[PDB]
Amino acid sequence: QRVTLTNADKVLYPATGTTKSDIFDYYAGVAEVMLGHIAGRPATRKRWPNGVDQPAFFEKQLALSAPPWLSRATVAHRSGTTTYPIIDSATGLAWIAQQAALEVHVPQWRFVAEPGSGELNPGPATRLVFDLDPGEGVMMAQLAEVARAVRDLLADIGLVTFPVTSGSKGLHLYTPLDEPVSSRGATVLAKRVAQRLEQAMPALVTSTMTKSLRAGKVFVDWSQNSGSKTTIAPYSLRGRTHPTVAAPRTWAELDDPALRQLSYDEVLTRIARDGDLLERLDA
Amino acid sequence: QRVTLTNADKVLYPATGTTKSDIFDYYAGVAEVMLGHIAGRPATRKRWPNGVDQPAFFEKQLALSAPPWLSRATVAHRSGTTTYPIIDSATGLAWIAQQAALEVHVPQWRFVAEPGSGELNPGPATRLVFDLDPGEGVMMAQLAEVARAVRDLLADIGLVTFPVTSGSKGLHLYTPLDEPVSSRGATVLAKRVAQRLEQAMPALVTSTMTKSLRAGKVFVDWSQNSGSKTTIAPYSLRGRTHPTVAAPRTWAELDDPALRQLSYDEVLTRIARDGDLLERLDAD
DNA sequence: GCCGCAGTAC
DNA sequence: GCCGCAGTAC
């Protein structure tokens, strides 16, 4: 119900002196605007128990010693079943904080309660996600040009798109689906989009991961809309040198030549001032 | 040089009762027709020492115990360094046979001696491969039809194409590049073909891997043209229930609604009649 | 002290 | 008898 934060004031990002208490407050701070974008969704963690200079690990399976109040659901998986935790409460974030789970990864679908059994099973996709990964020697304007064009192609079928600077290198774009659709269809559509863009912008865009083909291109990754993939949640910290955030931005911001990744402190100032840019993303 | 056959007449394919001796003879049998298409290339092995009902493993790195007379070359693999065997003699396939390396996998480029060095490093692609992979529910007619469409596109840019039934489920197509192109360009080229094909045959053809999109469609895999990938060598045996083979075929055969995979004995007698159907492919 | 703690493709 | 025996992505 509450999480007892141990190892407080212990540094996680050595380069900025960011403490485990700093993390706790951050997630408490962005709890309001972050929750609606991850509730209902299985939450993949990446964990740096011993700081950002120390070995990390990905974790999907939830520990059987993990708190009993954490909402949970399982997914039949190739090799075995996986029981995921759903983070859906300021209390859930506090756990993320103490678990040292700097990053929170979710897919673009939620669980749905079954008719008779009421079982929590994987539901349709409620939003699309695109991952724009600037390759060898790609500058901000080209990356933004590409991002605007993706927005254009989605605008062309009456959809709206929201820019999220991942805190890493990639720009993530999300589009809410007012009528949800299977993961497969959502992947058909993100793929059509990618491909179409790659057609119209051969020298500036690739729709494929093939690394040899990336130099000088923005890889428009449409595949993470796969039912079985994951994307770093908005408002989530990263595990890098500095403590940067998958921070929601405005389209005007992208027109900035010197545009940069946003820090946790900056994100907070901007929430209190304006609120959730992604508010319309999960009504 | 020399290779002692071990545990001859021990079974590897239980379903057919195929022994190491058979495997030994088979590779001996296809030596002449197979070598040209793997010589110069790093050989990845999939080995089933305890036959085809028991765990296998992918092997790339060459054991220190391996015969000194075997050809070698090293590729830098970012995580570390691998030095593969190159198969280039009848006695090399004897060793393969002996290793129980049922399958041989090569990429579409050969090694080339560096000027001052003589150090064998990876050179450009000498042939394009398409891997036509049938998704759930895809029947014979469709695999064949899509192959014929690829051939068409390829002939539309001055290239010929040879069909090989993979020994499994897939159908592979090779194209000579009498003038070698970087793996980067071969991949670019392959991807364009596949995307053009998919654009024109959306209901029947996909160009991406995504499993959830694969069903009912032929995945024209254009991406085994990367230099860091591998495709089963032609004439190679299969780690399958029955000892099927990556067998070169004729376009006419691909008209047959009951086209199936061929087994090694069928391949053998087929060579005797025709010789190598892929001769055009690796004129060195 | 350890160790494991993901997925699923080619 | 047990073990390893692949590399590369998202």
Numbering used by the authors:
A (entry chain B): 10 to 292
B (entry chain A): 10 to 88, 89A, 90 to 293
Quoted passage from the original study:
To understand the molecular basis for the proposed in trans templated polymerization extensions, PolDom was crystallized in complex with dsDNA containing a self-complementary 3′ overhang. The DNA substrate consisted of a template (T) strand (ten bases) annealed to a recessed downstream (D) strand (5 bases), resulting in a 5 bp 3′ overhang on the T strand. The complex consists of two PolDom monomers (residues 10–293), each bound to a DNA “end” forming two PolDom-DNA binary complexes. The binary complexes are brought together by a continuous molecular cradle, formed by the polymerases, that promotes synapsis between the discontinuous DNA termini. The 3′-overhanging template strands are further stabilized by a region of microhomology, formed by four Watson-Crick base pairs (G7-C10). PolDom interacts with the recessed 5′ phosphate of the downstream strand, noted previously (Brissett et al., 2007, 2011) and splays the templating strand at the ds/ss junction by ∼119°. The templating strand from one binary complex appears to terminate in the active site of the opposing PolDom monomer. This configuration effectively makes the outgoing “templating” strand from one binary complex an incoming “primer” strand for the other monomer and exemplifies the term in trans for this complex. For this transition to occur, the highly conserved loop 2 (residues 213–224), particularly residues Met215, Lys217, and Arg220 make direct contacts with the incoming 3′ strand and channel it toward the neighboring polymerase active site. Lys235 and Asp227 directly contact the primer terminus, and Gln230, Ser229, and Asp137 also form part of this hydroxyl recognition pocket.
